[PDB]
Amino acid sequence: RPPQFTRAQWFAIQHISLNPPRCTIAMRAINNYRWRCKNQNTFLRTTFANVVNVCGNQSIRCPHNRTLNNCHRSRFRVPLLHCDLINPGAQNISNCRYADRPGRRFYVVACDNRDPRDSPRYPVVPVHLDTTI
């Protein structure tokens, strides 16, 4: 969540991308938010709206929070991307390689209160991606 992108709008930036390029570069503009590299990421080929609408569906128990239900699983199967840090122990966004694996399924995103200056229409927005099922 850089000083240019919010916590949500920035989440979909790396967690969402209609046309997910080479995980190698696709992890550039994103990682640019921090100095370290990510251990995993999933870019769902869909618009933020299609994601925010999922936060209004029957919530369920999230994997990252076995004691909380602040997330919601996608109702309709959509084409998403699943990448992983193929460089275990490497902390260089310059030489940080990422794996690529296409797939069409749901997605577990943690929705939370957003700022009225970024998402006026949508009340809640995704800030984390557990996985894609």
PDB file of C-alpha atoms in Angstrom:
ATOM      1  CA  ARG A   1       0.000   0.000   0.000  1.00  0.00           C
ATOM      2  CA  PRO A   2       2.222   2.809  -1.349  1.00  0.00           C
ATOM      3  CA  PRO A   3       1.585   6.557  -0.903  1.00  0.00           C
ATOM      4  CA  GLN A   4       0.136   6.516  -4.420  1.00  0.00           C
ATOM      5  CA  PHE A   5      -2.268   3.579  -4.158  1.00  0.00           C
ATOM      6  CA  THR A   6      -4.707   2.799  -1.345  1.00  0.00           C
ATOM      7  CA  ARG A   7      -4.880  -0.474   0.582  1.00  0.00           C
ATOM      8  CA  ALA A   8      -7.678  -1.823  -1.615  1.00  0.00           C
ATOM      9  CA  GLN A   9      -7.117  -0.231  -5.023  1.00  0.00           C
ATOM     10  CA  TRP A  10      -3.527  -1.401  -4.568  1.00  0.00           C
ATOM     11  CA  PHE A  11      -4.575  -4.931  -3.614  1.00  0.00           C
ATOM     12  CA  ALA A  12      -6.358  -5.622  -6.903  1.00  0.00           C
ATOM     13  CA  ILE A  13      -3.403  -4.063  -8.718  1.00  0.00           C
ATOM     14  CA  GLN A  14      -1.321  -7.150  -7.942  1.00  0.00           C
ATOM     15  CA  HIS A  15      -4.147  -9.488  -6.932  1.00  0.00           C
ATOM     16  CA  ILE A  16      -6.178  -8.488  -9.989  1.00  0.00           C
ATOM     17  CA  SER A  17      -5.190  -8.095 -13.639  1.00  0.00           C
ATOM     18  CA  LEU A  18      -7.322  -8.861 -16.696  1.00  0.00           C
ATOM     19  CA  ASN A  19      -4.177  -9.724 -18.654  1.00  0.00           C
ATOM     20  CA  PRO A  20      -1.513 -11.023 -16.232  1.00  0.00           C
ATOM     21  CA  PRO A  21       1.885 -10.618 -17.945  1.00  0.00           C
ATOM     22  CA  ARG A  22       5.090 -12.510 -17.164  1.00  0.00           C
ATOM     23  CA  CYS A  23       5.110 -13.073 -13.401  1.00  0.00           C
ATOM     24  CA  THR A  24       8.714 -11.912 -13.774  1.00  0.00           C
ATOM     25  CA  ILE A  25       7.788  -8.354 -14.742  1.00  0.00           C
ATOM     26  CA  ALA A  26       4.192  -8.422 -13.511  1.00  0.00           C
ATOM     27  CA  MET A  27       5.817  -8.327 -10.074  1.00  0.00           C
ATOM     28  CA  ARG A  28       7.539  -5.024 -10.847  1.00  0.00           C
ATOM     29  CA  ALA A  29       5.039  -2.175 -10.548  1.00  0.00           C
ATOM     30  CA  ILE A  30       3.594  -4.122  -7.619  1.00  0.00           C
ATOM     31  CA  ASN A  31       6.627  -5.011  -5.501  1.00  0.00           C
ATOM     32  CA  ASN A  32       7.427  -1.335  -6.067  1.00  0.00           C
ATOM     33  CA  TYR A  33       5.272  -0.849  -2.970  1.00  0.00           C
ATOM     34  CA  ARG A  34       7.965  -2.403  -0.782  1.00  0.00           C
ATOM     35  CA  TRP A  35      11.695  -3.153  -0.794  1.00  0.00           C
ATOM     36  CA  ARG A  36      11.331  -6.910  -0.319  1.00  0.00           C
ATOM     37  CA  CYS A  37       9.813  -9.600  -2.539  1.00  0.00           C
ATOM     38  CA  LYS A  38       6.568 -11.548  -2.153  1.00  0.00           C
ATOM     39  CA  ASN A  39       6.436 -15.289  -1.480  1.00  0.00           C
ATOM     40  CA  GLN A  40       3.266 -15.686  -3.542  1.00  0.00           C
ATOM     41  CA  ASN A  41       0.556 -13.811  -5.444  1.00  0.00           C
ATOM     42  CA  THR A  42      -2.599 -14.340  -7.502  1.00  0.00           C
ATOM     43  CA  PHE A  43      -3.845 -11.998 -10.225  1.00  0.00           C
ATOM     44  CA  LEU A  44      -7.538 -12.596 -10.916  1.00  0.00           C
ATOM     45  CA  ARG A  45      -8.605 -11.568 -14.419  1.00  0.00           C
ATOM     46  CA  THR A  46     -11.548  -9.424 -13.321  1.00  0.00           C
ATOM     47  CA  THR A  47     -12.580  -5.872 -12.432  1.00  0.00           C
ATOM     48  CA  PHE A  48     -12.697  -4.536  -8.873  1.00  0.00           C
ATOM     49  CA  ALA A  49     -16.480  -4.279  -9.161  1.00  0.00           C
ATOM     50  CA  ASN A  50     -16.758  -8.014  -9.825  1.00  0.00           C
ATOM     51  CA  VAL A  51     -14.740  -8.516  -6.638  1.00  0.00           C
ATOM     52  CA  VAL A  52     -16.502  -6.008  -4.386  1.00  0.00           C
ATOM     53  CA  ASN A  53     -19.820  -7.637  -5.277  1.00  0.00           C
ATOM     54  CA  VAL A  54     -18.444 -10.872  -3.824  1.00  0.00           C
ATOM     55  CA  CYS A  55     -17.945  -9.246  -0.424  1.00  0.00           C
ATOM     56  CA  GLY A  56     -21.721  -8.950  -0.225  1.00  0.00           C
ATOM     57  CA  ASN A  57     -22.243 -12.695  -0.576  1.00  0.00           C
ATOM     58  CA  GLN A  58     -22.660 -15.300   2.164  1.00  0.00           C
ATOM     59  CA  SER A  59     -19.370 -14.993   4.051  1.00  0.00           C
ATOM     60  CA  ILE A  60     -17.460 -18.021   5.330  1.00  0.00           C
ATOM     61  CA  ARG A  61     -14.515 -19.122   7.469  1.00  0.00           C
ATOM     62  CA  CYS A  62     -11.274 -17.912   5.884  1.00  0.00           C
ATOM     63  CA  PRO A  63      -8.072 -20.008   5.892  1.00  0.00           C
ATOM     64  CA  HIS A  64      -5.857 -17.208   7.207  1.00  0.00           C
ATOM     65  CA  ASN A  65      -8.456 -16.569   9.912  1.00  0.00           C
ATOM     66  CA  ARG A  66      -9.834 -19.826  11.312  1.00  0.00           C
ATOM     67  CA  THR A  67     -11.352 -17.663  14.048  1.00  0.00           C
ATOM     68  CA  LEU A  68     -12.887 -14.915  11.912  1.00  0.00           C
ATOM     69  CA  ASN A  69     -15.116 -14.455   8.864  1.00  0.00           C
ATOM     70  CA  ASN A  70     -14.237 -11.087   7.329  1.00  0.00           C
ATOM     71  CA  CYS A  71     -13.771 -12.549   3.847  1.00  0.00           C
ATOM     72  CA  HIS A  72     -15.984 -13.999   1.113  1.00  0.00           C
ATOM     73  CA  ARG A  73     -15.468 -16.642  -1.574  1.00  0.00           C
ATOM     74  CA  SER A  74     -16.349 -15.872  -5.194  1.00  0.00           C
ATOM     75  CA  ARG A  75     -19.746 -17.184  -6.290  1.00  0.00           C
ATOM     76  CA  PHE A  76     -18.915 -17.463  -9.992  1.00  0.00           C
ATOM     77  CA  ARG A  77     -15.802 -19.138 -11.397  1.00  0.00           C
ATOM     78  CA  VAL A  78     -13.504 -16.621 -13.088  1.00  0.00           C
ATOM     79  CA  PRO A  79     -10.131 -16.850 -14.876  1.00  0.00           C
ATOM     80  CA  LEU A  80      -7.331 -15.973 -12.457  1.00  0.00           C
ATOM     81  CA  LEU A  81      -3.552 -16.358 -12.229  1.00  0.00           C
ATOM     82  CA  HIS A  82      -1.456 -18.022  -9.525  1.00  0.00           C
ATOM     83  CA  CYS A  83       2.213 -17.089  -9.156  1.00  0.00           C
ATOM     84  CA  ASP A  84       4.784 -18.064  -6.527  1.00  0.00           C
ATOM     85  CA  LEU A  85       8.250 -16.827  -5.564  1.00  0.00           C
ATOM     86  CA  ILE A  86      10.427 -19.321  -7.433  1.00  0.00           C
ATOM     87  CA  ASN A  87      13.353 -17.668  -5.653  1.00  0.00           C
ATOM     88  CA  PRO A  88      13.336 -18.971  -2.054  1.00  0.00           C
ATOM     89  CA  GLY A  89      15.622 -16.784   0.036  1.00  0.00           C
ATOM     90  CA  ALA A  90      16.092 -14.157  -2.665  1.00  0.00           C
ATOM     91  CA  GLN A  91      15.209 -10.608  -1.623  1.00  0.00           C
ATOM     92  CA  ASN A  92      15.725  -8.643  -4.839  1.00  0.00           C
ATOM     93  CA  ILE A  93      12.803  -7.305  -6.874  1.00  0.00           C
ATOM     94  CA  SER A  94      15.377  -6.960  -9.652  1.00  0.00           C
ATOM     95  CA  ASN A  95      16.144 -10.679  -9.866  1.00  0.00           C
ATOM     96  CA  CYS A  96      13.011 -11.979  -8.145  1.00  0.00           C
ATOM     97  CA  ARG A  97      11.477 -14.616 -10.417  1.00  0.00           C
ATOM     98  CA  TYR A  98       7.863 -15.757 -10.100  1.00  0.00           C
ATOM     99  CA  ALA A  99       6.036 -18.872 -11.295  1.00  0.00           C
ATOM    100  CA  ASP A 100       2.954 -18.782 -13.520  1.00  0.00           C
ATOM    101  CA  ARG A 101      -0.085 -21.061 -13.340  1.00  0.00           C
ATOM    102  CA  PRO A 102      -3.411 -20.274 -15.061  1.00  0.00           C
ATOM    103  CA  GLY A 103      -6.755 -21.417 -13.688  1.00  0.00           C
ATOM    104  CA  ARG A 104     -10.461 -20.637 -13.426  1.00  0.00           C
ATOM    105  CA  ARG A 105     -12.041 -20.737  -9.968  1.00  0.00           C
ATOM    106  CA  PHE A 106     -13.288 -18.683  -7.019  1.00  0.00           C
ATOM    107  CA  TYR A 107     -11.120 -16.425  -4.857  1.00  0.00           C
ATOM    108  CA  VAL A 108     -10.908 -15.690  -1.131  1.00  0.00           C
ATOM    109  CA  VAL A 109     -10.396 -11.969  -0.535  1.00  0.00           C
ATOM    110  CA  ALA A 110     -10.493 -10.245   2.853  1.00  0.00           C
ATOM    111  CA  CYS A 111     -12.889  -7.302   2.589  1.00  0.00           C
ATOM    112  CA  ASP A 112     -12.761  -4.446   5.098  1.00  0.00           C
ATOM    113  CA  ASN A 113     -13.876  -0.847   5.619  1.00  0.00           C
ATOM    114  CA  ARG A 114     -12.350   1.488   3.034  1.00  0.00           C
ATOM    115  CA  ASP A 115     -11.838   5.248   2.755  1.00  0.00           C
ATOM    116  CA  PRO A 116     -14.669   7.432   1.391  1.00  0.00           C
ATOM    117  CA  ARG A 117     -12.032   9.106  -0.779  1.00  0.00           C
ATOM    118  CA  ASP A 118     -11.125   5.960  -2.716  1.00  0.00           C
ATOM    119  CA  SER A 119     -14.246   3.784  -2.725  1.00  0.00           C
ATOM    120  CA  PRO A 120     -17.288   6.060  -2.261  1.00  0.00           C
ATOM    121  CA  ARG A 121     -19.710   3.737  -4.049  1.00  0.00           C
ATOM    122  CA  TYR A 122     -18.434   0.437  -2.650  1.00  0.00           C
ATOM    123  CA  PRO A 123     -18.661   0.211   1.164  1.00  0.00           C
ATOM    124  CA  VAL A 124     -16.125  -2.597   1.557  1.00  0.00           C
ATOM    125  CA  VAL A 125     -13.081  -3.648  -0.468  1.00  0.00           C
ATOM    126  CA  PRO A 126     -10.508  -6.476  -0.650  1.00  0.00           C
ATOM    127  CA  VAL A 127      -7.189  -6.006   1.145  1.00  0.00           C
ATOM    128  CA  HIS A 128      -5.800  -9.545   1.038  1.00  0.00           C
ATOM    129  CA  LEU A 129      -6.036 -12.734  -1.026  1.00  0.00           C
ATOM    130  CA  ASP A 130      -6.038 -16.058   0.823  1.00  0.00           C
ATOM    131  CA  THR A 131      -6.260 -18.323  -2.226  1.00  0.00           C
ATOM    132  CA  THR A 132      -8.248 -19.286  -5.321  1.00  0.00           C
ATOM    133  CA  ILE A 133     -10.705 -22.186  -5.232  1.00  0.00           C
TER     134      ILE A 133
END
